[PDB]
Design a protein around this ligand. Structure first.
Ligand code: HEM
Ligand SMILES: C=Cc1ccc(C(=O)O)cc1
Ligand SMILES: [Cl-]
Length: 393
């Protein structure tokens, strides 16, 4: 039998401090029923990993938010990659894989790193900064829109559109309906920049459109794949870099280990993705009746996966609530797992690595010197404001 819990994983009280409720969710059983929203939940590593790696049974084509696309209309045309199953998913995935490939990383790495060093040097001249606005947001804003090949005007829509996208995966609570109500201008901007004429040659966007003659995608599919990168590519890395700086501020012994070996930067960022998990929850929909962890779940049922909880499950991790930059992180689900595992993870890791590398070489300490403010979102975890003082090395 399935235990029934009344915990609302989309409530502000839950966002404010999710870990006690996540333990309650893990320890209640491998599968729980959340009466507040009539969905099944899995919060342990083993079950989250199993659901992610069974796309036939736990599909994405009926949406990865609460809404079931077989019952309700999506709020925007479905993503051709995130909200598709194999085999429809395979070829657009292949394209984005080759757009966001190792060879692409080689062409952008020097410029991404130069931009990270310049930013830290500029922030060190200020001393007292907001690590969100002035670093976690400013740095990805200074590299990603240009890497995409976006024009300069209208970029103020990028972060609002992303927050709308991740809020829309949630239930129809105030967070979701508020975001959708104010969505029209951001939707208009993003959709217009997805068209080939508006994307600079050499960028990720033009590269997607240039892939439309191999037989893997058609020209009418390319704008939606550009839309995918502009939905998923910015706010996630913003919260990821914010997580990393927040972690280095709360664990000064780890900042000091990072300083002494800056080659730890890539794993320091990976551990921050596990520790804070910028993408906290995602849904699947069962395509049949299925046994999961000794539990039978009917067909057509939504299953809420707790990625951040799987990443703190003491059944899988030693000392899961410690930030440890030399941890063996392989297997964490902060980027997902299986056929949909984050196709932009090389970009994310590049941004985070070069930013933590710059801090490792230029910063002696990071001290919180003001009120920390949390940013609330139905799917994303991160901070609104992180007042810090940077001490130059
Ligand atoms: C720290 C940063 C990031 C995190 C935590 C993150 C998280 C995730 C997760 C958990 C998934 C799996 C979704 C699912 O299984 O339903 C995913 C997929 C995806 N991500 Fe990321 N992501 C990050 C950065 C990026 C970047 C930088 C890009 C693009 C430049 C990107 C684009 C995508 C896309 C297009 C998908 C769909 C993949 C598919 O369905 O095959 N993400 N991301
Ligand atoms: C992991 C978040 C995510 C959001 C949007 C999309 C998309 O729009 O395809 C993909 C991934
Ligand atoms: Cl849209």
């Amino acid at each position: 039998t399935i235990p029934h819990l009344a915990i609302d994983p989309f409530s502000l009280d839950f966002f404010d401090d999710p870990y006690p409720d996540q333990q309650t969710l893990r320890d209640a059983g491998p599968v729980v029923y959340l009466d507040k929203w009539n969905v099944y939940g899995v919060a342990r590593y083993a079950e989250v990993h199993a659901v992610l790696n069974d796309p036939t049974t736990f599909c994405s084509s009926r949406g990865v938010g609460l809404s079931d696309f077989k019952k309700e209309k999506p709020w925007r045309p479905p993503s051709l990659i995130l909200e598709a199953d194999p085999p429809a998913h395979t070829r657009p995935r292949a394209v984005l894989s080759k757009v966001l490939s190792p060879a692409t990383m080689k062409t952008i790495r020097d410029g991404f790193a130069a931009a990270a060093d310049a930013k830290v040097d500029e922030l060190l001249q200020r001393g007292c900064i907001d690590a969100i606005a002035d670093l976690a947001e400013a740095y990805p804003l200074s590299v990603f829109p240009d890497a995409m090949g976006l024009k300069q005007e209208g970029r103020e829509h990028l972060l609002p559109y992303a927050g709308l996208v991740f809020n829309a995966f949630g239930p129809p609570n105030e967070l979701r309906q508020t975001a959708i109500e104010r969505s029209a201008p951001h939707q208009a901007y993003v959709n217009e920049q997805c068209q080939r004429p508006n994307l600079a040659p050499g960028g990720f966007g033009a590269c997607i459109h240039a892939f439309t003659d191999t037989g893997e995608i058609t020209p009418d599919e390319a704008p939606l794949l550009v839309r995918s990168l502009l939905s998923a590519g910015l706010d996630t890395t913003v919260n990821g870099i914010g997580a990393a700086v927040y972690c280095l501020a709360r664990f000064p012994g780890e900042l000091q280990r990072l300083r002494s070996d800056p080659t730890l930067a890539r794993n320091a960022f990976e551990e921050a993705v596990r520790f804070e998990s910028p993408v906290q929850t995602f849904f699947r929909t069962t395509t049949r009746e299925v046994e999961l962890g000794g539990a039978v779940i009917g067909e057509g049922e939504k299953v809420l996966m707790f990625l951040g909880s799987a990443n703190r499950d003491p059944r899988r991790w030693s000392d899961p609530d410690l930030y440890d930059i030399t941890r063996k992180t392989s297997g964490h689900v902060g980027f997902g797992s299986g056929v949909h595992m984050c196709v932009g993870q090389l970009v994310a890791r590049l941004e985070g690595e070069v930013m933590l590398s710059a801090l490792a070489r230029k910063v002696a300490a990071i001290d919180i010197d003001g009120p920390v403010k949390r940013r609330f979102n139905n799917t994303l975890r991160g901070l609104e404001s992180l007042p810090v003082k940077l001490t130059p090395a």
